[PDB]
Structure 1
Amino acid sequence: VGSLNCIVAVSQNMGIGKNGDLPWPPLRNEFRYFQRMTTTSSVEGKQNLVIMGKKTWFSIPEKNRPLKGRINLVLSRELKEPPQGAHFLSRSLDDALKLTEQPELANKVDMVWIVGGSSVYKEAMNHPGHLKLFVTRIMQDFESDTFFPEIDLEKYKLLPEYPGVLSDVQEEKGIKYKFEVYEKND
């Protein structure tokens, strides 16, 4: 089993997507951060398991799938055979987790990352115990149509200076943004 983390990149107005896409111009260093965080395993030899919705999966340039050095798991109610390149296809979130309990995935998985979308987040956030949130805050407003569930600052404790996370303000093409990490442990 192990560790359960969610990583999101959100506009000032809580927008995460637009048109089966990202609302802002591509920020490589975020994408190189999303990549590094998801990939980095604690214990040597173990890999990270990343879970995403269907639409999220097909939004990675066909090029990029699966996301190398991680187990690619995709949720769908509808598909019957895992997507081309995915390694696991599950029907519910809870099955995805139930998957990692399996002694055959017990030794090979480290951290689980909920990399989106929009509903995985929400039931992933209502799930008891410990959960860490890795929020990139674009310090601007974007025109979005799918949004991130509000952080319950009295349920979620925003951690000041965490390991391997550059706590300061960034800029890529005039867009300023920072790396945050919220925790909950009830």
Structure 2
Amino acid sequence: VGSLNCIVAVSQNMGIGKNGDLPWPPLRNEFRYFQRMTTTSSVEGKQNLVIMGKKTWFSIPEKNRPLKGRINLVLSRELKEPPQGAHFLSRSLDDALKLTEQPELANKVDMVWIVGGSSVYKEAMNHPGHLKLFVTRIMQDFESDTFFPEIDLEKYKLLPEYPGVLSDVQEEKGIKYKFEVYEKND
């Protein structure tokens, strides 16, 4: 309860994506791993609440939306009503987090998962409480427009091998990448 988990991928050049798209082509392993990973709930009888940005939402194909298995939440400050296909909408991060933290929703929601974008990470990056951050390093040079902020090792712990997550380097379509785990101390 009241737990926040961050999960995002980044290129070896500290890249996240260009024009709202990942530097590397669609990865069947990265896509399945992400879904299967989030789908893997620790507590039975509960649902996971994920939050995505406007860019991320519009970037996700309708073929997958709404994403079954988990509740999709979009963060929009300009929009008044939630977008078609979305489960809920929040004006700000504090609003979405506060609502999910409230007993009213706490009964239905237990843990939260951040699925981008950088804007959401930036706001959450200033969280005082304990928070988890999953960074995937892609061993390959690719073009990117947005850069990811450097994580403080003094505050964040480098977890190369964590239970549930694979440590071995995967390879798809000639693209090698590794999953890294980061934990922030309170």
- TM-score w.r.t. the length of structure 2 is 0.95
Q: Does 1:135 align with 2:138?
A: no
Q: Does the CA-based 8 Å contact 1:158-1:182 persist in structure 2?
A: yes
CA offset at residue 136 of structure 1? 1.3
Matches within 5 A, 1:3-82: 3-82=3-82
CA offsets per residue over residues 92-129 of structure 1, 9 Å max, x none? Answer: 00001001122221111121011100110111111111
Identity among equivalent positions (%) equals 100
Unaligned runs of 5+ in 2: none
CA offsets per residue over residues 9-65 of structure 1, 9 Å max, x none? Answer: 101111111112111111111111111222222211101100011111111111111
Q: Does the CA-based 8 Å contact 1:5-1:114 persist in structure 2?
A: yes
Structure-1 separation of matches of 2:101 and 2:169: 38
Q: Does the CA-based 8 Å contact 1:12-1:139 persist in structure 2?
A: yes
CA offsets per residue over residues 151-181 of structure 1, 9 Å max, x none? Answer: 2111110124211111111110111101110
Partner of 1:113, secondary structure, is strand
Q: Does the CA-based 8 Å contact 1:50-1:112 persist in structure 2?
A: yes
Structure-1 separation of matches of 2:27 and 2:154: 31
CA offset at residue 74 of structure 1? 0.5
CA offsets per residue over residues 59-108 of structure 1, 9 Å max, x none? Answer: 11111112211111111111111111101110100001001122221111
- TM-score w.r.t. the length of structure 1 is 0.95
Unaligned runs of 5+ in 1: none
Q: Which residue matches 1:154? A: 154
Cα root mean square deviation, aligned: 1.2
Structure-2 separation of matches of 1:100 and 1:150: 28
